[PDB]
Amino acid sequence: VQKVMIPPINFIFKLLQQHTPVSIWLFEQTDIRLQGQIRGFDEFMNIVLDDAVQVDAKNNKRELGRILLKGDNITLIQAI
Amino acid sequence: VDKPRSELSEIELARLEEYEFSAGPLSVLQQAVKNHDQVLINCRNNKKLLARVKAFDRHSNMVLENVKEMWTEGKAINKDRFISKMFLRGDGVVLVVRIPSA
Amino acid sequence: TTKMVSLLNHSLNVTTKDGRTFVGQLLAFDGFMNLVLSDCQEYRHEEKRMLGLVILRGEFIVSLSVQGPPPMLLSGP
Amino acid sequence: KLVRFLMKLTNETVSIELKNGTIVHGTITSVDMQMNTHLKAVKMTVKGREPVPVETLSIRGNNIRYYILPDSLPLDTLLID
Amino acid sequence: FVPVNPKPFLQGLIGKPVLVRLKWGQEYKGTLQSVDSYMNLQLLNAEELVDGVKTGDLGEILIRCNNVLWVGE
Amino acid sequence: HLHHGKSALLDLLVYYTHPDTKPPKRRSLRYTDTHYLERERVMSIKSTPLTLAVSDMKGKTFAFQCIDTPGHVDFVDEVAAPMAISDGVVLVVDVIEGVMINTTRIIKHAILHDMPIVLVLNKVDRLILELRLPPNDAYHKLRHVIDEVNDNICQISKDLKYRVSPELGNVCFASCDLGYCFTLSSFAKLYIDRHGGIDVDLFSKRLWGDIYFDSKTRKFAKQSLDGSGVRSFVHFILEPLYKLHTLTISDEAEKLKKHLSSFQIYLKPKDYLLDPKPLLQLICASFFGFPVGFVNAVTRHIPSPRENAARKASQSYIGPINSSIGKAILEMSREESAPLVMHVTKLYNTVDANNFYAFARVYSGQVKKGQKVKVLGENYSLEDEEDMVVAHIAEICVPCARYRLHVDGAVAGMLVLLGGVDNSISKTATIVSDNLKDDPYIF
Amino acid sequence: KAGAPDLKKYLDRQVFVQLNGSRKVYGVLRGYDIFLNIVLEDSIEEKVDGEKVKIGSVAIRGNSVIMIETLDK
Amino acid sequence: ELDTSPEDSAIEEDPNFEIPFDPFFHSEDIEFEHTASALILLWAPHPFNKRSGATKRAQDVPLIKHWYLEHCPPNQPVKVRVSYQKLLKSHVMNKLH
Amino acid sequence: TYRRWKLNLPQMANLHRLGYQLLSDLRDDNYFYLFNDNSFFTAKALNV
Amino acid sequence: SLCIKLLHETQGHIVTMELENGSTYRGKLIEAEDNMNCQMRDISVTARDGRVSHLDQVYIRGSHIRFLIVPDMLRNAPMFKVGPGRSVPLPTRGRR
Ligand SMILES: Nc1nc2c(ncn2[C@@H]2O[C@H](COP(=O)(O)OP(=O)(O)OP(=O)(O)O)[C@@H](O)[C@H]2O)c(=O)[nH]1
Numbered sequence A: 001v002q003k004v005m006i007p008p009i010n011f012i013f014k015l016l017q018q019h020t021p022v023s024i025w026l027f028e029q030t031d032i033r034l035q036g037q038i039r040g041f042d043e044f045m046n047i048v049l050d051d052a053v054q055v056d057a058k059n060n061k062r063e064l065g066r067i068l069l070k071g072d073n074i075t076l077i078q079a080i
Numbered sequence B: 001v002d003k004p005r006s007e008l009s010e011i012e013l014a015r016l017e018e019y020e021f022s023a024g025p026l027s028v029l030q031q032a033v034k035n036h037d038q039v040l041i042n043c044r045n046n047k048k049l050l051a052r053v054k055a056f057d058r059h060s061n062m063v064l065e066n067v068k069e070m071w072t073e074g075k076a077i078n079k080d081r082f083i084s085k086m087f088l089r090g091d092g093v094v095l096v097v098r099i100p101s102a
Numbered sequence C: 001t002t003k004m005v006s007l008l009n010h011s012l013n014v015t016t017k018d019g020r021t022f023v024g025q026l027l028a029f030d031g032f033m034n035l036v037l038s039d040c041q042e043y044r045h046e047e048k049r050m051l052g053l054v055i056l057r058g059e060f061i062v063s064l065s066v067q068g069p070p071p072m073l074l075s076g077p
Numbered sequence D: 001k002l003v004r005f006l007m008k009l010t011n012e013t014v015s016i017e018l019k020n021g022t023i024v025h026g027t028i029t030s031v032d033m034q035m036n037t038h039l040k041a042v043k044m045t046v047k048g049r050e051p052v053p054v055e056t057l058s059i060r061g062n063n064i065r066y067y068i069l070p071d072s073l074p075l076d077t078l079l080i081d
Numbered sequence E: 001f002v003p004v005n006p007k008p009f010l011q012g013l014i015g016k017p018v019l020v021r022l023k024w025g026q027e028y029k030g031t032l033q034s035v036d037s038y039m040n041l042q043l044l045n046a047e048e049l050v051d052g053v054k055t056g057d058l059g060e061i062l063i064r065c066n067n068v069l070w071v072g073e
Numbered sequence F: 001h002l003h004h005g006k007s008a009l010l011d012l013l014v015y016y017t018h019p020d021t022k023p024p025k026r027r028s029l030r031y032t033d034t035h036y037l038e039r040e041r042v043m044s045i046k047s048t049p050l051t052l053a054v055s056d057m058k059g060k061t062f063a064f065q066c067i068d069t070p071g072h073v074d075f076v077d078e079v080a081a082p083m084a085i086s087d088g089v090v091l092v093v094d095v096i097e098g099v100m101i102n103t104t105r106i107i108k109h110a111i112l113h114d115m116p117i118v119l120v121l122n123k124v125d126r127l128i129l130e131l132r133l134p135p136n137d138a139y140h141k142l143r144h145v146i147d148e149v150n151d152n153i154c155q156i157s158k159d160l161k162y163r164v165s166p167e168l169g170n171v172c173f174a175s176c177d178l179g180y181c182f183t184l185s186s187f188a189k190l191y192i193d194r195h196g197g198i199d200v201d202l203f204s205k206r207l208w209g210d211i212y213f214d215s216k217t218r219k220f221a222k223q224s225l226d227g228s229g230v231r232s233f234v235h236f237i238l239e240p241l242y243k244l245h246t247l248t249i250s251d252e253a254e255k256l257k258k259h260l261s262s263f264q265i266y267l268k269p270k271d272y273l274l275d276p277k278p279l280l281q282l283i284c285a286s287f288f289g290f291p292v293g294f295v296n297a298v299t300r301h302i303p304s305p306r307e308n309a310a311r312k313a314s315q316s317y318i319g320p321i322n323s324s325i326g327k328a329i330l331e332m333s334r335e336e337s338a339p340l341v342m343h344v345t346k347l348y349n350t351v352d353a354n355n356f357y358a359f360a361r362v363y364s365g366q367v368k369k370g371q372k373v374k375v376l377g378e379n380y381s382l383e384d385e386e387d388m389v390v391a392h393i394a395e396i397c398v399p400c401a402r403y404r405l406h407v408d409g410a411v412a413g414m415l416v417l418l419g420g421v422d423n424s425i426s427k428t429a430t431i432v433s434d435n436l437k438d439d440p441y442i443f
Numbered sequence G: 001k002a003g004a005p006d007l008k009k010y011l012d013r014q015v016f017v018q019l020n021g022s023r024k025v026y027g028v029l030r031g032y033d034i035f036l037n038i039v040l041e042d043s044i045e046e047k048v049d050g051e052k053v054k055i056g057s058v059a060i061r062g063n064s065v066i067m068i069e070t071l072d073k
Numbered sequence H: 001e002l003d004t005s006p007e008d009s010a011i012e013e014d015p016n017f018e019i020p021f022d023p024f025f026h027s028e029d030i031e032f033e034h035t036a037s038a039l040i041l042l043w044a045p046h047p048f049n050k051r052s053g054a055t056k057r058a059q060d061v062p063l064i065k066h067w068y069l070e071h072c073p074p075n076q077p078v079k080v081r082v083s084y085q086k087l088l089k090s091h092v093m094n095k096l097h
Numbered sequence I: 001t002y003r004r005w006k007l008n009l010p011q012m013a014n015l016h017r018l019g020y021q022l023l024s025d026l027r028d029d030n031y032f033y034l035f036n037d038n039s040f041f042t043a044k045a046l047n048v
Numbered sequence J: 001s002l003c004i005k006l007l008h009e010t011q012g013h014i015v016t017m018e019l020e021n022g023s024t025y026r027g028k029l030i031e032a033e034d035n036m037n038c039q040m041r042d043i044s045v046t047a048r049d050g051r052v053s054h055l056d057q058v059y060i061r062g063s064h065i066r067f068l069i070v071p072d073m074l075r076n077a078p079m080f081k082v083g084p085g086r087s088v089p090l091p092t093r094g095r096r
């Protein structure tokens, strides 16, 4: 009746397959947030994003295209 | 080389280490060592370093000689200090830019 | 790291990344140089605080120095 | 390895810039492969603070910013393995 | 559909002009030609776009791995 | 039971805590015997208490107040009496001999008295070196012994609280002669430390009955259709143990040396040229260090005295719980103002048979030497107030079998030997402080 | 080498996570990694003012996790 | 009586449980070439279960002491039984003092 | 001086095989129940 | 290592620890790991400014620890010699 445990790597793999857009947070930049569709990751979860947009507190969305985000900065991963 | 797999033993790790220099970005250190080119350093405390580079480590640990180190900060006033020889831990390096001697 | 063993039971003052200073007697250290200090006093800028037995993390430590020496034939024809 | 260059040189006077901005000046006793430096008869000058002398002191490897080395060492031979 | 891993992504980008962003608000534009496994990179004829404005030219660049925030374009 | 190895279990800890002691020439150490008669018959006759500090699986050090007991049938005094002032029973069962009549009696009386039981399957090495059973049949023998113990438990109370099985961490496999006593979790941790990061509890819970490991899929099947896999316990525990024993015994110096070098266990060259049994002991002491599995199992499955105060008061004490003395017993208060309540169930001979030491568990309050206490007999009550005897407390000691530690005072939850108060005590007695509220009761 | 953190008792329970930079996230813990990377479902974020936004499914990097808290008796 | 055995309870929780490492001694076998003889020697009488000793003198080895330390074989003449008994008596008298 | 010996496993096994007529076959010690030294001392003391 | 051994020794007592924030925690330690992840009970948090709050169950990550104030009577805890391979400081009886 219980539910099995889902490791974070498998969760991010599920996000990769489902093409669910995400909202990545940053290590210390509270205001700066990134959104987009995920495209790749590694064991260190250096995340390769597609159609990346840099959203700020007042929604100053700036297009960045496809970018690679170093894992040292990701604080949080959002599901839409 | 066809071994970036990152699962290696000591001899192939050393081969990959030497290739990380011979073609990697740290290759800039070798021709700076052999050409005795001017190299400018940006430290993580907003420091400017320019000097000859003599030897470097994979960690970017660098031995420098004849260093001209400047810093700016009353009103913003730029000041300079020349020191003979340096051992700089590659931990604090942000950037290197070479001034060609030629 | 053999020299580090020579500092056992000595009185040490350790400057931290915060900037404080802990003074006390060393009990045991670590490979990451986690320190165990007995009868520890705190130097917060100077203010005095009794702490007691304190385990410092390796990251927290910046520098350390000693302040005191460690507390201390049969016959013939 | 290059940290070996550190241990191959010993008991010379060296000024040291730590991580926080403090300057210490003294002769090294022994340094480690892991960059733990041991200093004797040194002059500890904390940033913005009055200089204070201590008989010995040791620094963690992550706190070393750079070294002020003397002019009396055969560096070319010193660098050889 | 086809996922692209970080290292294949960047090695399939060697020689292209890119905008790398540091952890602290500085963006550098230039072309890269060589990278090792630790994802620290080298640029050629690069320029710093501080606050989005072109100030000076630096030439070739080597950035340490930890300073960078993202790489793009 | 008799000669199942319960004194060797305590010798295993004594060898580690007391570096001075050395094994005898022609027999076992048999620490906690301490009687020339018992050294003559080579069997325990008296229940000698032993207090020593042992180390937990993680590094924590506890203070085990273990009481050794005889295994002979006629000496069940020294099991029933000391058990009334203990929190649990560690049952040592020989795997070769199996469950015997005294083991059945001990199990019945422990479950009847609500006593948690920790099972130690001793003399495992006799399955490898004497009986020469194959690993699978050895597993079957171990399982049968555990099932017999569980049956003996079920004959009294079918509660699931008293159920011994390795996956609960309640059963330790030991060979006290060779000097090892591990559990599922201890051996699992000994894998984990070597081979990286995997949760010890999850790994250890999958090392028992008919859970099969598939060497190609690296997964735990359930039935292993045909011969796909071998039993997890045998694959991961018994086979490595057998191979360790055989490498030591079978005179393979180079192979054993290489395997120990892989574990960073380094022996002097003169050590490989030893007698087979001391070489086995050396290898097992280097491979399996302190018996941390037994300590961890005891600490986890036997309540601490503070936690067991309520159960002890409900079972042993006969007076009203709501009274001040009953509240003091329940809280196990240690302050001086609290009443002093202790239960003496045993008397022990001095080195010369002149005076007796009373073996007491301090249920509440504090005690200092020279204190005035009032001794209550076996049938002291409001009807019979003439069983009271006023006595002083000459000396308080912490027992260690072959020596004593003298303490100026003791606190609640401690088992101590009292000198100077033995004349009024026959069999058992209750000791309470004289300056105390009215109406004292006896255990 | 590394070691698996003990978080089996925290699974499938309403939890509060404190991230770096004065962040705070609700949620039900659903998984964890060696480096304490945690996974949350139907979670809720707190802001400095105090109003709660539904934040959703969350996969926190273990580097930034300060504390993990349960509230039940 | 258990509703669900601990076995299915353990397997059912994360049925995809994975451990990469092998058992300790994997390349070896539980029995080597000399294991049988070693076991035979392990439970042998005193001289032959050692592998290390101290070279007693030639006359300090009795070689037949166990013959009369044990019981006398049955169906022997009276003189043999008496010889067994007298030698045992001498040994006992030696051991007593 | 010929004061200490160390033998292999095959050597000890072969010596045990060769001198097989002159060594006991008990390995139990429960065989000597009332026929060991202390019982003999008791019997001598009691004159039985 | 001896320091993590002492930290494990502390479990069950009341230990005060402060993190990289500057807040100090006063509670009963119930679990500890080699990473120095800690589980606590009945915490009385004193903020950096001085605000006092209360917590019931926390799981503090080890990497965010500055130091701990272990109860004093653990000064006499034994510091065992650690061999090369051993990962827990325990009494030894073999070669080393
Ligand atoms: N082969 C083998 N023999 C063992 C082991 N442990 C104990 N023994 C032997 O068991 C016999 C009895 O050991 P004791 O420690 O006196 O057992 P005991 O339970 O204390 O005996 P009692 O006190 O009379 O009940 C001795 O011959 C021990 O050498 C073991 O692990 N393996």
Ligand SMILES: [Mg+2]
Binding pocket: F006, F007, F043, F044, F068, F069, F070, F071
């Ligand atoms: Mg006994």
